[PDB]
């Protein structure tokens, strides 16, 4: 019987997660950013080991399972919200963010990751660069982005593009200040979507086991599964 199992996979390119998670400036949530990730290898344990994450939840996958899987594309959506709002970034949620800013589908496949960015995104005197939408006639559909800036009509009289009685500019600034309580402090959020189409899966986590020689083992070479003893060879294989 095979003494032990060895799995061999190419050395293991890189996916540009650093540019998503360590970006200088994040988007406002109403105008959230989407980055397509493709054709690359990702170590997801670099993610789940970065220690200051306040939220990290995966829905149709698991973090340790990720480093073995391949997908067609990964989409990284990113923005800033308040701490108390982080919980709305989840399937089945309602609230100001889920309804009017950024909406996950009930059947979501991926991970929601958040951390406190008070040091980066709060300013003495208030950071007005980050906005959310407070007023909308109906809820967003999943992954809808609404960047319009039309005066919202709360009452019976048309606004005609002028703000006034029951005519409100639809966006507000967060005005993040470092003296705010933690519920009101800015959090950076990354939503990873893992897409599997009928197509080549080119965004790849897997594993590499130490090679053993002259021992009966069950080996996995790049998906070739077999059993036998591996010994030195004199065959001149062509490079391909």
């Amino acid at each position: 019987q095979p003494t032990e199992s060895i799995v061999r996979f190419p050395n293991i390119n890189l996916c540009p997660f650093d540019e998503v998670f360590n970006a200088t400036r994040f988007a406002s949530v109403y105008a959230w950013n989407r980055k397509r990730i493709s054709n690359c290898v990702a170590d997801y344990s670099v993610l789940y080991n970065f220690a200051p994450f306040s939220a990290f939840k995966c829905y149709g996958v698991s973090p340790t399972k990720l480093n073995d899987l391949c997908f067609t594309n990964v989409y990284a959506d990113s923005f800033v919200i308040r701490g108390n709002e982080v919980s709305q970034i989840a399937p089945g949620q309602t609230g100001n963010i889920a309804d009017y800013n950024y909406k996950l589908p009930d059947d979501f496949t991926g991970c929601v990751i958040a951390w406190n960015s008070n040091k980066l995104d709060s300013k003495v005197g208030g950071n007005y660069n980050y906005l959310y939408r407070l007023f909308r006639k109906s809820n967003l559909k999943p992954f809808e982005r609404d960047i319009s800036t039309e005066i919202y009509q709360a009452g019976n009289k048309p606004c005609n593009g002028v703000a006034g009685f029951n005519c409100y500019f639809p966006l507000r600034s967060y005005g993040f200040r470092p003296t705010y309580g933690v519920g009101h402090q800015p959090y950076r959020v990354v939503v990873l979507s893992f897409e599997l189409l009928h197509a080549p899966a080119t965004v790849c986590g897997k594993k590499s086991t130490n090679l053993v020689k002259n021992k009966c083992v069950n080996f996995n070479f790049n998906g070739l599964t077999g059993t036998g003893v591996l010994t030195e060879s004199n065959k001149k294989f062509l490079p391909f």
Partner: protein, 39 residues
């Protein structure tokens, strides 16, 4: 009715922010959301 009070709550959200009560402003923001959600 609903509209008078909506306007008053909006105005207090804005004045709170203008007088440097940002956190309080945010809390009224949340009330506006909840109140506009009701029938």
């Amino acid at each position: 009715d609903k509209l008078w009070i909506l306007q008053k709550i909006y105005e207090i959200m804005v004045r709170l922010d203008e007088e440097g009560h940002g956190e309080a402003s945010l809390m009224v923001s949340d009330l506006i959301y909840e109140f506009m959600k009701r029938d």
